[PDB]
């Protein structure tokens, strides 16, 4: 039952190509109190978790971004709301804000403290490489169980081709 | 048959890798940078639009990622992936190909690394594309888990009529 995730602001980072990430502040008891930061590809898979674990629940994230401007002042500013909103229902509801992998993206259980911080966002953050890494993956996955489906398709195809020739043979006889 | 000169680790903080290649046609006429990921994307291209036919080198990964015996034998392989691309005239003329070594309007000998990042694609467009086909290939999947469906009801009506012959 952890008080409400408030989202205080954003900052783009540079590697040479940048990326933003949100420094979410988050209260457990009115005393004590830590800070996360986490990019959108985060909430992104966060939310997907809780698409498969609550399928009776949807929660909103504002859109993606692949080619207007990501780091546009307004379209930040505006994600960023979306982003709050985002985790106001998340903590409202109750399997939903205990949930394990909640836990997790809040670091309920072992929260790192000013100077840990960014330590526990490097591991934690899925960067857009890594992310692609992912899909290449599945991608190759998908493409394992299509084949198997592809086969297996052929064989009843077969089957079905002696099964005809087994009717035209007993028709005439 | 342009040819390639070596290879760079070049970094924007994070590492990637490039190819220095030399790029002539019939010579006495100039240089370009080219990720190896540009290799196999134009390679993914080349098996989509010449299906019956297909050119060098498979997957790299999961393990150290610069291994110099790793780099010459991966560039062995994108030499004679070149000299594939050259062996046959339609690849040679081949859209994504001729726009893939400058073939339309070359730059000149100046403009290498310009030329580079405006070619390759950024990580978000291969992200975008990525999720396109992974969305498309579910499709498939899922229509083809329906004939699979159709197909098995097919069985069962064929033995049904077996069954049926057999005792007449």
Redesign the interface.
Known sequence: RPSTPTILGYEVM????KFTVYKILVKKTPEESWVVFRRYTDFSRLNDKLKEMFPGFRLALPPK???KD?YNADFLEDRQLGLQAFLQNLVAHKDIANCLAVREFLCLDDPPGPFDSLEESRAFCET??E??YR??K??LE??K??ES??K??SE??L??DT??N??RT??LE
């Open positions: 540079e590697e040479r190509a971004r692949w080619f990501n857009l490489e992310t692609n899909l290449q599945e991608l998908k493409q169980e299509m489906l592809k297996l398709l009843k195809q089957h079905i099964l005809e087994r009717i007993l028709s």
